[PDB]
Amino acid sequence: EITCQENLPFTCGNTDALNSSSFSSDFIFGVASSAYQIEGTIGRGLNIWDGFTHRYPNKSGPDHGNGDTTCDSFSYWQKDIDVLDELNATGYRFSIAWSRIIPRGKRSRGVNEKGIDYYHGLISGLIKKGITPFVTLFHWDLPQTLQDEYEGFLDPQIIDDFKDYADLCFEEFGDSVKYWLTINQLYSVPTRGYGSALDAPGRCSPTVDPSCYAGNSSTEPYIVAHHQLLAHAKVVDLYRKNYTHQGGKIGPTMITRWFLPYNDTDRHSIAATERMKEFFLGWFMGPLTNGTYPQIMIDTVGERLPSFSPEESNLVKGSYDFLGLNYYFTQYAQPSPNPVNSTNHTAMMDAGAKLTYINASGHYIGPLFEKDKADSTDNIYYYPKGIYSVMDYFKNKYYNPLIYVTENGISTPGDENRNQSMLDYTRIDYLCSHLCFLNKVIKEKDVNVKGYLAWALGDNYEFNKGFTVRFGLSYIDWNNVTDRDLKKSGQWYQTFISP
Amino acid sequence: EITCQENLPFTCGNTDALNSSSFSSDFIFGVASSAYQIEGTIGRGLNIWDGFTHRYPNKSGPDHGNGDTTCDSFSYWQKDIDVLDELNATGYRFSIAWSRIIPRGKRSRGVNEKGIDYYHGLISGLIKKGITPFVTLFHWDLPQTLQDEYEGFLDPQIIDDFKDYADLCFEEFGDSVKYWLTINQLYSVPTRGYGSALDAPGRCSPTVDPSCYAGNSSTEPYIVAHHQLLAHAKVVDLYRKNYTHQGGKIGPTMITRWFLPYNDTDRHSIAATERMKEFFLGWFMGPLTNGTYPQIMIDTVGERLPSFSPEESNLVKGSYDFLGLNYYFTQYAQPSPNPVNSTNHTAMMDAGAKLTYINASGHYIGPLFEKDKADSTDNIYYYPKGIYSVMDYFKNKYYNPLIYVTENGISTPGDENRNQSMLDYTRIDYLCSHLCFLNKVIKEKDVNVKGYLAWALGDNYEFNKGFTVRFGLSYIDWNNVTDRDLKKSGQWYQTFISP
Numbered sequence: 001e002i003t004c005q006e007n008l009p010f011t012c013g014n015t016d017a018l019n020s021s022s023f024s025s026d027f028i029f030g031v032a033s034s035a036y037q038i039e040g041t042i043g044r045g046l047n048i049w050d051g052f053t054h055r056y057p058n059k060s061g062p063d064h065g066n067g068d069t070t071c072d073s074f075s076y077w078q079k080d081i082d083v084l085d086e087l088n089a090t091g092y093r094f095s096i097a098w099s100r101i102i103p104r105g106k107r108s109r110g111v112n113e114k115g116i117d118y119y120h121g122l123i124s125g126l127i128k129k130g131i132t133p134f135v136t137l138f139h140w141d142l143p144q145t146l147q148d149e150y151e152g153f154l155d156p157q158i159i160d161d162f163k164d165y166a167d168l169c170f171e172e173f174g175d176s177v178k179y180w181l182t183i184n185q186l187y188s189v190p191t192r193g194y195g196s197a198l199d200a201p202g203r204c205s206p207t208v209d210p211s212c213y214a215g216n217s218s219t220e221p222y223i224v225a226h227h228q229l230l231a232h233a234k235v236v237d238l239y240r241k242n243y244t245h246q247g248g249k250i251g252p253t254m255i256t257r258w259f260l261p262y263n264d265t266d267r268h269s270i271a272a273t274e275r276m277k278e279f280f281l282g283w284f285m286g287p288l289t290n291g292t293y294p295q296i297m298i299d300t301v302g303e304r305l306p307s308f309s310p311e312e313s314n315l316v317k318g319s320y321d322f323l324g325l326n327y328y329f330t331q332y333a334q335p336s337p338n339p340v341n342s343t344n345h346t347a348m349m350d351a352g353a354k355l356t357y358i359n360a361s362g363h364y365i366g367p368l369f370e371k372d373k374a375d376s377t378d379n380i381y382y383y384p385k386g387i388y389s390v391m392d393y394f395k396n397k398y399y400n401p402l403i404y405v406t407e408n409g410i411s412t413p414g415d416e417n418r419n420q421s422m423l424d425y426t427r428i429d430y431l432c433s434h435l436c437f438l439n440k441v442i443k444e445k446d447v448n449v450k451g452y453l454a455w456a457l458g459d460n461y462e463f464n465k466g467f468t469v470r471f472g473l474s475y476i477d478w479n480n481v482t483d484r485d486l487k488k489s490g491q492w493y494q495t496f497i498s499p
Numbered sequence: 500e501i502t503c504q505e506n507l508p509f510t511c512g513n514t515d516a517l518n519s520s521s522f523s524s525d526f527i528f529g530v531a532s533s534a535y536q537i538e539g540t541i542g543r544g545l546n547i548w549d550g551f552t553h554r555y556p557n558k559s560g561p562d563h564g565n566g567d568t569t570c571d572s573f574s575y576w577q578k579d580i581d582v583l584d585e586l587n588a589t590g591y592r593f594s595i596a597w598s599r600i601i602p603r604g605k606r607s608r609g610v611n612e613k614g615i616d617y618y619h620g621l622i623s624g625l626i627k628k629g630i631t632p633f634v635t636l637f638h639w640d641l642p643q644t645l646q647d648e649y650e651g652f653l654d655p656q657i658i659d660d661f662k663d664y665a666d667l668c669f670e671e672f673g674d675s676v677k678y679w680l681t682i683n684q685l686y687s688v689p690t691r692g693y694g695s696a697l698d699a700p701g702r703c704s705p706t707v708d709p710s711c712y713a714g715n716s717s718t719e720p721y722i723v724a725h726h727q728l729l730a731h732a733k734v735v736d737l738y739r740k741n742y743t744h745q746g747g748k749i750g751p752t753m754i755t756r757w758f759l760p761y762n763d764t765d766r767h768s769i770a771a772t773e774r775m776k777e778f779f780l781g782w783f784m785g786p787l788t789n790g791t792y793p794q795i796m797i798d799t800v801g802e803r804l805p806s807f808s809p810e811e812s813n814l815v816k817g818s819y820d821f822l823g824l825n826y827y828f829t830q831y832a833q834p835s836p837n838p839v840n841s842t843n844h845t846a847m848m849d850a851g852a853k854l855t856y857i858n859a860s861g862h863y864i865g866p867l868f869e870k871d872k873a874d875s876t877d878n879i880y881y882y883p884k885g886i887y888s889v890m891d892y893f894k895n896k897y898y899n900p901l902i903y904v905t906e907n908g909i910s911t912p913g914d915e916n917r918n919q920s921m922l923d924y925t926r927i928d929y930l931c932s933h934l935c936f937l938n939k940v941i942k943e944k945d946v947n948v949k950g951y952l953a954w955a956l957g958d959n960y961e962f963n964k965g966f967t968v969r970f971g972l973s974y975i976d977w978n979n980v981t982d983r984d985l986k987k988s989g990q991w992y993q994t995f996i997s998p
């Protein structure tokens with residue numbers, strides 16, 4: 001019987017008590033990264049995140065940093081590969097920058113050969129080292145040209161361009177890549193990119209944010225989420241129909257959170273937690289497992305929620321071979337009003353829930369996750385048992401899918417110096433306690449989890465944060481980005497994989 | 500009678516001997532800047548120069564600098580205005596970033612109100628201070644979206660988009676702006692952007708540069724120059740037909756050089772200098788004054804040179820109210836072969852001329868202009884009498900046009916520290932000696948020169964050079980860009996304008 005601690009101090013950092021041998025022998029352990037965060041702009045066209053970080057530098061981070069050079073993996077990808085090889089990792093998830101291989105967006109405008117070569121070299125190098133690539137087709141870095149031609153995912157013309165892009169990738173890399181993540185965290189772009197304008201492209205209602213160049217926080221997230229689903233379903237249908245000879249699997253990446261009631265005996269708090277589960281997860285998981293949106297969403301959102309045609313509904317339903325789950329933390333939910341007529345209404349208010357990390361009797365959900373310096377009542381706290389609850393939920397509610405944990409990690413302040421940043425014990429506690437609950441759920445609930453990829457390989461540009469927080473397991477000196485040095489967390493992870 | 504020195508040491512730095520009173524009372528003296536060099540990416544969409552400097556950082560400059568924040572005139576435009584006010588300057592040439600006011604390129608996709616406000620404030624502030632704005636509609640910063648939709652100026656669809664952009668500007672700013680420069684330095688983009696790939700968008704033949712993503716150095720510069728002329732002619736026709744109530748003037752900006760024979764008694768050197776004059780100036784000036792290309796170009800370039808239709812020819816001919824001339828330096832020309840069948844052939848070889856700063860008997864053309872550290876046989880030297888020869892040439896060869904010198908300046912190394920950079924006497928010599936020859940040509944040849952704008956107002960991002968050279972008359976600390984401090988050159992210029 002497996003016992004896991006939910007509060008500090010954790011003792012699972014000991015690999016005599018927990019290591020890769022606690023899991024099935026085929027279990028994949030690795031790390032993850034994304035193109036915009038690690039590559040640099042060298043050699044590629046521009047994408048909406050280059051646009052956003054430049055047009056609105058105070059949304060790029062408090063240091064106004066961006067992905068211009070970041071850790072320069074365009075030059076030093078071979079160092080990324082030596083860190084993995086040093087961990088004896090069997091999995092690496094990275095993303096192909098659409099901008100690098102089709103700079104002008106539409107495929108008929110020509111492909112960038114030098115870009116295609118960059119990824120062949122990378123894939124060849126990983127596989128030579130016995131590392132399985134999980135490649136994300138789209139990690140938020142849409143070619144700027146498509147956002148300016150028709151406002152990206154706001155328009156249905158994105159579906160065919162995305163499909164021609166994906167086709168180019170399966171054809172070029174599919175012989176070696178056997179695992180494809182179509183779109184990374186479905187929930188993010190529509191809410192942050194089109195609801196609150198905290199992420200690219202930064203659209204939202206004028207009174208939600210007056211910096212926004214355009215938008216409607218009330219209608220656009222629903223129009224964007226819809227197209228993301230059709231786009232995704234159309235790539236999966238292209239994959240399973242035209243590239244089945246490649247013997248790969250392809251699936252979506254869902255940002256998952258667990259929700260607990262703020263007051264676990266107030267029915268209003270209980271209804272708000274069930275509504276969160278539906279607006280956060282079901283919004284995407286419902287179309288993917290059933291071809292339609294959740295009923296609470298259809299009731300609440302009404303005309304602002306697009307309908308799937310019977311053909312579209314059939315294409316989206318069951319459009320995955322597995323699910324990639326990104327899990328970071330859990331929130332307490334309590335009711336909150338949905339003012340549909342206010343000019344500052346957003347799609348996120350439609351859930352009628354307010355989210356916190358402290359419940360009604362003042363209990364904090366777990367240890368600290370991310371210190372907010374501007375406001376401390378905004379601090380984020382994590383909850384190791386959340387990975388247990390989310391996985392058990394997905395098994396029971398969504399037909400026992402094959403699952404890969406594609407991102408799980410914790411940042412530490414960039415303020416810290418080199419000695420302090422290399423001694424990241426708070427990261428060992430985060431990862432070890434989630435790994436202890438992940439092993440327990442695989443064993444007790446028989447969830448079909450087949451892999452785990454820690455975020456991130458090394459320090460890189462963090463969306464909305466610049467270089468002010470660090471997520472890597474290996475250290476990078478911003479004044480000289482050549483070396484990736486294993487921090488304590490990286491040395492711990494190494495001993496975990498090979499005990 | 501006016502005597503001007505052509506070699507160091509110059510003595511025209513004395514304002515008792517030369518000052519604004521040497522010129523007609525209406526003569527406009529000022530400074531110039533461009534949007535990409537001074538604004539920063541904050542608040543605007545991305546353009547091809549953001550794309551280029553990011554995709555190919557080693558072409559952005561030896562320091563890999565770019566226009567991300569540069570001197571941040573988006574925030575500190577009011578400091579730009581205090582420097583001008585301190586000079587008692589009557590002219591300021593600046594450019595409107597197409598990306599800032601129409602981020603998505605095509606006007607029907609919506610205009611950026613906050614962007615339009617930025618320039619209203621700027622124009623209101625200049626005019627309140629008695630400074631005449633010369634506004635450039637296009638200073639190389641084409642929206643990235645138009646370059647990715649149809650490869651920018653390579654396609655004729657640019658003509659209508661550029662015309663809808665310009666229409667938006669005359670309508671928004673035309674009530675205050677009475678001087679419009681349509682496209683800045685016609686010769687540059689086609690040769691550097693489409694011939695040698697040293698500038699954005701960076702297209703060129705694979706063997707001219709293997710970094711190029713696409714291109715043809717032999718055909719594309721001619722296709723680009725042609726469209727630049729049609730685009731320009733169509734904006735001028737829109738201006739003179741739809742905004743004549745505004746009582747403004749509009750003209751092109753031509754990068755002018757003077758050419759001298761390498762050997763001034765070898766006929767081959769003399770023919771090469773006359774050919775340079777035609778390929779460098781006549782390429783644009785011929786269509787503008789006659790509606791057709793020079794005959795040496797029609798003979799030499801043959802099928803690769805596009806033809807104007809009779810309607811297009813009529814539209815381009817006489818499509819200016821004045822000319823803006825940018826003059827920097829003069830070159831010696833000698834013959835050089837034109838190998839039309841080599842795979843590394845470029846439109847620039849078609850002139851059959853090799854350019855140098857030292858003639859056949861070893862005489863250097865004038866004082867040093869720009870030290871090339873990688874190769875010193877590449878150093879650039881200036882020639883003050885060149886502004887005299889160019890102006891006299893334009894008067895005689897091109898129907899005595901109304902002229903404004905829209906750029907003239909010299910850089911000093913960014914290597915120099917603050918004390919050395921504020922003591923820029925080499926800049927006083929450059930400007931004073933050109934101003935001495937400009938006054939002489941106005942007086943002796945009666946050229947219709949009505950203004951002079953020194954480049955640049957302050958230190959900014961320099962195309963292909965990063966922040967490694969400084970062109971400003973006012974100093975900017977890259978570690979704190981708030982202040983613009985007048986260097987010696989700026990204090991000299993101040994005393995020149997108001998003796």
Ligand SMILES: *[C@@H]1O[C@H](CO)[C@@H](O[C@@H]2O[C@H](CO)[C@@H](O[C@@H]3O[C@H](CO[C@H]4O[C@H](CO)[C@@H](O)[C@H](O)[C@@H]4O)[C@@H](O)[C@H](O[C@H]4O[C@H](CO)[C@@H](O)[C@H](O)[C@@H]4O)[C@@H]3O[C@@H]3OC[C@@H](O)[C@H](O)[C@H]3O)[C@H](O)[C@H]2NC(C)=O)[C@H](O[C@@H]2O[C@@H](C)[C@@H](O)[C@@H](O)[C@@H]2O)[C@H]1NC(C)=O
Nearest residue numbers: 286287289290291292293294295296298299302307308313
């Ligand atoms: C998994 O997918 C299933 C579909 O494949 C989901 O089941 C569907 O659920 C729909 C409800 O959301 C349901 O459609 C409704 O059907 C009502 C009756 O339709 C028939 O009979 C009518 C009766 O007079 C007749 O007029 C019709 O012509 C049909 O013959 C209909 O009245 C409903 O419309 C009203 O309400 C909806 C909001 O739900 C409004 O959009 C609409 O304007 C109107 O006010 C509704 O019809 C739908 O109306 C909108 C239109 O775009 C659709 O085409 C139309 O269908 C439908 O019958 C079933 N389908 C089947 C095959 O059972 C299933 O949902 C869950 O299960 C059902 C039983 C229900 O409890 C849902 O709330 C559940 O969530 C999906 N499962 C999950 C887990 O979500």
Ligand SMILES: *[C@@H]1O[C@H](CO)[C@@H](O[C@@H]2O[C@H](CO)[C@@H](O[C@@H]3O[C@H](CO[C@H]4O[C@H](CO)[C@@H](O)[C@H](O)[C@@H]4O)[C@@H](O)[C@H](O[C@H]4O[C@H](CO)[C@@H](O)[C@H](O)[C@@H]4O)[C@@H]3O[C@@H]3OC[C@@H](O)[C@H](O)[C@H]3O)[C@H](O)[C@H]2NC(C)=O)[C@H](O[C@@H]2O[C@@H](C)[C@@H](O)[C@@H](O)[C@@H]2O)[C@H]1NC(C)=O
Nearest residue numbers: 785786788789790791792793794795797798801806807812
């Ligand atoms: C200012 O603009 C003027 C035009 O408004 C320029 O003058 C034009 O110059 C053209 C030469 O470049 C000239 O066109 C040529 O005309 C030849 C005769 O055409 C008529 O008579 C023919 C004789 O049999 C007959 O077949 C025709 O149908 C006409 O009736 C013609 O043979 C030439 O074509 C050959 O050479 C050209 C290269 O120059 C090739 O492109 C072509 O394939 C062919 O090999 C040529 O015709 C042109 O052919 C190409 C086609 O696209 C054009 O439509 C066609 O015109 C034209 O006659 C004059 N126009 C007038 C009204 O005089 C003027 O140029 C300068 O002055 C002329 C006299 C000449 O010396 C040029 O070299 C000068 O540069 C411009 N001024 C300046 C300063 O450039």
Ligand SMILES: *[C@@H]1O[C@H](CO)[C@@H](O[C@@H]2O[C@H](CO)[C@@H](O[C@@H]3O[C@H](CO)[C@@H](O)[C@H](O)[C@@H]3O[C@@H]3OC[C@@H](O)[C@H](O)[C@H]3O)[C@H](O)[C@H]2NC(C)=O)[C@H](O[C@@H]2O[C@@H](C)[C@@H](O)[C@@H](O)[C@@H]2O)[C@H]1NC(C)=O
Nearest residue numbers: 261262263264265266267268269270334359360361362363
């Ligand atoms: C988690 O939620 C539960 C259920 O909502 C909370 O318990 C409820 O707390 C209410 C106070 O917010 C209690 O109602 C009050 O009852 C007193 C005594 O009769 C009355 O004087 C108050 O005015 C109020 O009455 C309500 O007024 C509004 C009317 O519309 C309504 O009809 C009345 O009920 C309520 O009885 C109580 N329910 C139960 C089942 O315990 C719980 O709140 C916490 O516990 C209660 C016992 C009390 O000590 C609260 O002060 C305390 O916060 C909540 N838990 C926490 C930690 O917030």
Ligand SMILES: *[C@@H]1O[C@H](CO)[C@@H](O[C@@H]2O[C@H](CO)[C@@H](O[C@@H]3O[C@H](CO)[C@@H](O)[C@H](O)[C@@H]3O[C@@H]3OC[C@@H](O)[C@H](O)[C@H]3O)[C@H](O)[C@H]2NC(C)=O)[C@H](O[C@@H]2O[C@@H](C)[C@@H](O)[C@@H](O)[C@@H]2O)[C@H]1NC(C)=O
Nearest residue numbers: 760761762763764765766767768769833858859860861862
């Ligand atoms: C500026 O250009 C002028 C004209 O091109 C240069 O003068 C010419 O220089 C040529 C040498 O490059 C002279 O030709 C040579 O003549 C000698 C004596 O007879 C002969 O032995 C050589 O082989 C050569 O002859 C040519 O060979 C190739 C044949 O196809 C052709 O038919 C022959 O002419 C040429 O006579 C001379 N012309 C004139 C009008 O002076 C000038 O070059 C400089 O001045 C001359 C006088 C001489 O001292 C050169 O060495 C010197 O460079 C050139 N100026 C400079 C500074 O480069």
Ligand SMILES: *[C@@H]1O[C@H](CO)[C@@H](O[C@@H]2O[C@H](CO)[C@@H](O)[C@H](O)[C@H]2NC(C)=O)[C@H](O)[C@H]1NC(C)=O
Nearest residue numbers: 205206207215216217218219303304342343344
């Ligand atoms: C966002 O878009 C929605 C949909 O067009 C706008 O809501 C409509 O507003 C009009 C005018 O007030 C009403 O007549 C409709 O009844 C509303 N429709 C729905 C479906 O809600 C909304 O005003 C827009 N919001 C902003 C901030 O632009």
Ligand SMILES: *[C@@H]1O[C@H](CO)[C@@H](O[C@@H]2O[C@H](CO)[C@@H](O)[C@H](O)[C@H]2NC(C)=O)[C@H](O)[C@H]1NC(C)=O
Nearest residue numbers: 261262263264265266358359360361362363364
């Ligand atoms: C807030 O969270 C705490 C922690 O889970 C809840 O406290 C537990 O409540 C159960 C049931 O009452 C007790 O058996 C446990 O002993 C409690 N744990 C702790 C650490 O005290 C608490 O009930 C939650 N409060 C509300 C209002 O939901």
Ligand SMILES: *[C@@H]1O[C@H](CO)[C@@H](O[C@@H]2O[C@H](CO)[C@@H](O)[C@H](O)[C@H]2NC(C)=O)[C@H](O)[C@H]1NC(C)=O
Nearest residue numbers: 704705706714715716717718802803841842843
């Ligand atoms: C640039 O474009 C020109 C025009 O297409 C190419 O030149 C042609 O090349 C073909 C194939 O060799 C020949 O049959 C034609 O006679 C050429 N046309 C002309 C007008 O010169 C050229 O090869 C291209 N260059 C590169 C480097 O792409």
Ligand SMILES: *[C@@H]1O[C@H](CO)[C@@H](O[C@@H]2O[C@H](CO)[C@@H](O)[C@H](O)[C@H]2NC(C)=O)[C@H](O)[C@H]1NC(C)=O
Nearest residue numbers: 760761762763764765857858859860861862863
């Ligand atoms: C190179 O440039 C120099 C400088 O202009 C030329 O020298 C002048 O030539 C004329 C005519 O021979 C003389 O009267 C001047 O006295 C010369 N000036 C100097 C400073 O010596 C020279 O002729 C040019 N050489 C060639 C081959 O073109």
Ligand SMILES: *[C@@H]1O[C@H](CO)[C@@H](O)[C@H](O)[C@H]1NC(C)=O
Nearest residue numbers: 015016017018019021022499
């Ligand atoms: C790995 O962990 C298991 C418990 O799951 C333990 O029994 C085993 O001895 C550990 N292996 C090493 C090499 O420490």
Ligand SMILES: *[C@@H]1O[C@H](CO)[C@@H](O)[C@H](O)[C@H]1NC(C)=O
Nearest residue numbers: 055056058059210211541542
């Ligand atoms: C951030 O920049 C935007 C301009 O895009 C501006 O509207 C906003 O006030 C800035 N925020 C702060 C807190 O300075």
Ligand SMILES: *[C@@H]1O[C@H](CO)[C@@H](O)[C@H](O)[C@H]1NC(C)=O
Nearest residue numbers: 020086087088089497498499
């Ligand atoms: C890497 O992992 C494999 C598989 O568990 C193991 O056999 C091997 O010894 C490990 N190598 C290192 C250097 O730890």
Ligand SMILES: *[C@@H]1O[C@H](CO)[C@@H](O)[C@H](O)[C@H]1NC(C)=O
Nearest residue numbers: 163167234237238239241242
């Ligand atoms: C599969 O590829 C073929 C050949 O290019 C094409 O006709 C077909 O539409 C594709 N099928 C899809 C995308 O389902």
Ligand SMILES: *[C@@H]1O[C@H](CO)[C@@H](O)[C@H](O)[C@H]1NC(C)=O
Nearest residue numbers: 207208339342343344345349
């Ligand atoms: C606008 O929205 C904010 C945050 O959602 C809220 O504080 C404010 O009261 C809203 N304004 C109105 C008029 O409802």
Ligand SMILES: *[C@@H]1O[C@H](CO)[C@@H](O)[C@H](O)[C@H]1NC(C)=O
Nearest residue numbers: 477479480481482483484485
């Ligand atoms: C940058 O880091 C690498 C790896 O530590 C080192 O070899 C190189 O010399 C460093 N460069 C400088 C300028 O110190």
Ligand SMILES: *[C@@H]1O[C@H](CO)[C@@H](O)[C@H](O)[C@H]1NC(C)=O
Nearest residue numbers: 514515516517518520521998
């Ligand atoms: C300005 O220059 C002229 C010569 O062009 C000279 O005569 C005049 O005295 C100068 N003015 C001043 C104020 O020095």
Ligand SMILES: *[C@@H]1O[C@H](CO)[C@@H](O)[C@H](O)[C@H]1NC(C)=O
Nearest residue numbers: 042043554555557558709710
């Ligand atoms: C400049 O960068 C390009 C990549 O875009 C590369 O091909 C070239 O070799 C680099 N030049 C030098 C001198 O390093």
